[PDB]
């Protein structure tokens, strides 16, 4: 009886592949070959934050593109003012093994989580200003890998087990649960329209979810190894995935297949962080070989290298206005990079 | 306006206070030693923790030295992702039940995978070959996992290094040293890294594990410091 189910499933996968192949009438490189190259991108560091004393996993820019939070394995969550390098806040975490952090769009709350399977939300604005645990959300089985504030009262998280959860911070239990992945979900990203979000797991596939009704809308299986970072295009109709293949790939929801591949022969290490610029033309990818690369998204050609980190680049972020690019690494340093005219 | 100066000096005061707090925390952070207690499934991890929610942390002080021990309780069997978080720990205490399926082979594969990790190549491993008394009984009764599973045990002899264990059957010593030799051959394979292996036939609930772990951590720290001074 099961063999019939397997045959039906493989027939459906074959027909989906055939539909995708028939949909492919051209190639992104073929159409973009007549576009002026971006050219060499000389980015230099402007600020260096030297407060953390342990390797750093996560960071998130503020809505004002000035305040940024950072999470380090000594159980520390530091909120910096990037303009003046001053430390606005320093929060000691109960669990020293942090793997993700988020900064609320309103700026009043900060998310944190890790191997304790508990998402801690900290209230920055209190009657005295002292930071305290606003609420702990529990219920995930695997390690909390990523978390993003959907709203001041809603937060979406991904766990070590194959499960994402949209919570209600007011009441503290999962409002919706998204399941269907095969491996550990490593990264998360929220679409600009706030209606959808993509999740990349360790099964070499990325799934698109809608927070309203809560089931997978599309699945992309272009990669061939664990996916470590995902991020929507600023348009909201595409996203990029970084994997252990030493390859970054671009997917489109409407096309529902590959668009462009960002592989290079000299690159052997995997990708740990992927982010876009404000216009989306530049794709900044953090690599394990102590460096960071800038790719022309429409040409798949390297445009610059953000060298200067003494360890692997674990986290990368781009400001909302696209004024500077922050990169954190395991050498307990955050470097902010900018271009010069 | 005078305001800009007011918030600027307030920011300076807050930054200096936070810097003082960070230095105070840095002292404690550098004082404590972090250890990751992994294991080969059932190997006696719970009994060892009792003798000495995601992750469990145990704080114990020996000889005025503080040790935090982290055990991954509520985690999935796929370790290829969250194990990278423990690259900078002082040591990984790997407990192996030397006594269903071939547990020894799975433990050997896990140890080889940990040893050959690109992020864990600088992290030392302390081997706890537990259940030595259980292994003794197995060998004495005839139950074998050393010859039955590994046909090279017939063409094996007890190494002439040492035998600190007191009066015991030569077969039991040969078996335990064969297992230790398999682990050591896995560890000392050709490669690179600043890590070292510390095998131990513990099977001890008399707080001897405290002394063993403390001595191993002392050795690891001394070797790292000497390597900083390129004395070896």
């Amino acid at each position, epitope marked *: 009886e099961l063999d019939q189910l397997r045959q039906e499933a493989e027939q459906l996968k074959n027909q989906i592949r055939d539909a995708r192949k028939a949909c492919a009438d051209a190639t992104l490189s073929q159409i973009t070959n007549n576009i002026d190259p971006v050219g060499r991108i000389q980015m230099r560091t402007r600020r260096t934050l030297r407060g953390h004393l342990a390797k750093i996993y996560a960071m998130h820019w503020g809505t004002d593109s000035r305040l940024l939070v950072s999470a380090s394995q000594d159980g520390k969550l530091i909120i910096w003012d990037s303009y003046t390098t001053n430390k606005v806040h320093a929060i000691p975490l109960r669990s020293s093994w942090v793997m993700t952090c988020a900064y609320a769009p309103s700026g009043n709350y900060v998310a944190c989580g890790g191997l304790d399977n508990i998402c801690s939300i900290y209230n920055l604005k209190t009657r005295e200003g002292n930071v305290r645990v606003s609420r702990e959300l529990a219920g995930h089985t695997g390690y909390l890998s990523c978390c993003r504030f959907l709203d001041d009262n809603q937060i979406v998280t991904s766990s070590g087990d194959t499960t994402c959860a949209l919570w209600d911070i007011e009441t503290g239990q999962q409002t919706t649960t998204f399941t269907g992945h095969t491996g550990d979900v490593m990264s998360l990203s929220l679409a600009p329209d706030t209606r959808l979000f993509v999740s990349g797991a360790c*099964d*070499a596939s990325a799934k698109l979810w809608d927070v309203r009704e809560g089931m997978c809308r599309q699945t992309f299986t272009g*990669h061939e190894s664990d996916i470590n970072a995902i991020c929507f295009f600023p348009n909201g109709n595409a996203f990029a995935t970084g994997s252990d293949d030493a390859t970054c790939r671009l997917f489109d929801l409407r096309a529902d297949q590959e668009l462009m591949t960002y592989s290079h022969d000299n690159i052997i290490c995997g990708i740990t962080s992927v982010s876009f610029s404000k216009s989306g033309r530049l794709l900044l990818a953090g690599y394990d070989d102590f460096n960071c690369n800038v790719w022309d998204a429409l040409k798949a050609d390297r445009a610059g290298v953000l060298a200067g980190h003494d360890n692997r680049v674990s986290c990368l972020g781009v400001t909302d206005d696209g004024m500077a690019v922050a990169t954190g690494s395991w050498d307990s340093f955050l470097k902010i990079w900018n271009g010069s005219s | 306006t005078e305001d800009q100066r007011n918030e600027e000096k307030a920011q300076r005061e807050a930054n200096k206070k936070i810097e003082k707090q960070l230095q105070k925390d840095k002292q404690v952070y550098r004082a404590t030693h972090r250890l990751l207690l992994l294991g080969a499934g059932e190997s006696g991890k719970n009994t060892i923790v009792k003798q000495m929610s995601g992750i469990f942390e145990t704080k114990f002080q020996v000889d005025k030295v503080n040790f935090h021990m982290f055990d991954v309780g509520a985690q999935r069997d*796929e370790r*290829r992702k969250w194990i990278q978080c423990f690259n900078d720990v002082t040591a990984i205490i790997f407990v192996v039940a030397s006594s269903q*399926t*071939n547990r020894l082979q*799975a433990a050997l594969k896990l140890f080889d995978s940990i040893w050959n990790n690109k992020w864990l190549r600088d992290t030392s491993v302390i081997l706890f070959l537990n259940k030595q008394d259980l292994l003794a009984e197995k060998v004495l009764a005839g139950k074998s996992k050393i010859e*039955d599973y*590994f046909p090279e045990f017939a063409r094996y002899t007890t190494p002439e290094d040492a035998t600190p264990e007191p009066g015991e059957d030569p077969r039991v010593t040969r078996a335990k040293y064969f297992i230790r030799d398999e682990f050591l051959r896995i560890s000392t394979a050709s490669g690179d890294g600043r890590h070292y292996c510390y095998p131990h036939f513990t099977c001890s609930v008399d707080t001897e594990n405290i002394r063993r772990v403390f001595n191993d951590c002392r050795d690891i720290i001394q070797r790292m410091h000497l390597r900083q001074y390129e004395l070896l």
Partner: nanobody
Amino acid sequence: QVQLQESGGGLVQPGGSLRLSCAASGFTFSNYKMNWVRQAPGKGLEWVSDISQSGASISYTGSVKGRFTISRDNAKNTLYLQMNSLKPEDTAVYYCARCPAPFTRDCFDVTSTTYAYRGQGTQVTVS
């Protein structure tokens, strides 16, 4: 997308010879270390053999060494496992697995309950 599909097996008498063929059509075969694992009808997953990217490094779980031979062919992007002199304890399901990281001497979660990069099943029985 990896699509690790293997074949072979069946009902054989003890002391027979079987040849399991495994094919991958979702990645570059030569870049990954390959292996075979075995799941008994009443037991859990158990790694049985492994071969490196080029074939220089080959290792076995024991009690099957000399009896089992593993060999990959990069031109056909396939792999073969030749087993001889079957005992009435090898009746189980054999999985042709590729562990995740390429160009790496390490790979951790081949023998996991819910591995993603493991192929389908193939029953072989001896009696």
